[PDB]
Amino acid sequence: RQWALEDFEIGRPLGKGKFGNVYLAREKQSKFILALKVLFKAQLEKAGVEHQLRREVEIQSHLRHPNILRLYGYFHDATRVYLILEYAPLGTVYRELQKLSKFDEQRTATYITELANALSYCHSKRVIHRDIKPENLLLGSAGELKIADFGWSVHAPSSRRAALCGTLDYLPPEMIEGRMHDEKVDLWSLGVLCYEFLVGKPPFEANTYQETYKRISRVEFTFPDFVTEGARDLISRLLKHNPSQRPMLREVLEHPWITANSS
Numbered sequence: 001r002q003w004a005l006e007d008f009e010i011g012r013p014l015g016k017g018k019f020g021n022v023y024l025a026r027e028k029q030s031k032f033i034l035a036l037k038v039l040f041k042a043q044l045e046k047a048g049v050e051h052q053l054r055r056e057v058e059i060q061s062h063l064r065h066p067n068i069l070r071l072y073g074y075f076h077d078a079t080r081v082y083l084i085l086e087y088a089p090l091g092t093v094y095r096e097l098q099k100l101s102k103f104d105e106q107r108t109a110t111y112i113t114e115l116a117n118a119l120s121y122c123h124s125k126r127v128i129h130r131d132i133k134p135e136n137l138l139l140g141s142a143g144e145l146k147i148a149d150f151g152w153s154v155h156a157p158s159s160r161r162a163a164l165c166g167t168l169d170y171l172p173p174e175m176i177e178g179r180m181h182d183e184k185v186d187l188w189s190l191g192v193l194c195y196e197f198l199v200g201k202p203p204f205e206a207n208t209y210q211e212t213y214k215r216i217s218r219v220e221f222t223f224p225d226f227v228t229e230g231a232r233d234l235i236s237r238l239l240k241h242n243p244s245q246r247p248m249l250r251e252v253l254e255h256p257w258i259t260a261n262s263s
């Protein structure tokens, strides 16, 4: 279980990050292709995220699902921290969306069930991702969804407001205004994503932070003409200010529009 930088051959930079980037890497002894999250120790302390990184490692290493990016192990040196994660061959859902502008009802529903199934596993172990966004969703060889970047992930109903600033597009009312958040946070993020996948943009996307804050707090979104009644229904049920009004993940999986359009 003991790793070092010299045991790997570094390749193409897969994606850009905040505290460090993701690179393609091969383990010399096995020829195993994987992803390396190189995070600089200096930037971690100068923001106070060292504990959240340990929470990320603690969570992701014990989680085992075909729609959750596996964390094989970790190591560090006199400068950086390294996360040995699985490599998603088909890239991010973010690029997939940028390329296609918007997705069809089939693709949206398939991604929704896949995400829900992975969240159903997460919530059965009482683990909340909180940062469910296309930037954190990846794609395997089969084109299957894969949840990554468990940085803001927490256990039990917590008050540890971590995302704070940055884009709030996917954070529910509870998270944006302190109030203790639970599993329902991901159910909100699910609707944000279902909307975004069909429309090409998030339901509350504004020009400023304070602008988006209003739209999230008042839950003010408007569907375009090309949005189906079935799609509109699922999104309306998911995007409710009150958490107890949002449905259980099984109801999402059961939903007519989901079953009629999924795979």
Ligand SMILES: Cc1cc(Nc2nccn3c(-c4cn[nH]c4)cnc23)sn1
Pocket (backbone or CB within 6 Å): 014, 015, 022, 035, 037, 069, 085, 086, 087, 088, 089, 090, 091, 092, 138, 148, 149
């Ligand atoms: C063709 C292609 C494949 C890509 N693969 C990946 N891109 C970005 C991030 N990736 C991770 C990852 C995310 N969080 N922790 C690790 C794993 N595989 C990737 S990109 N273009």
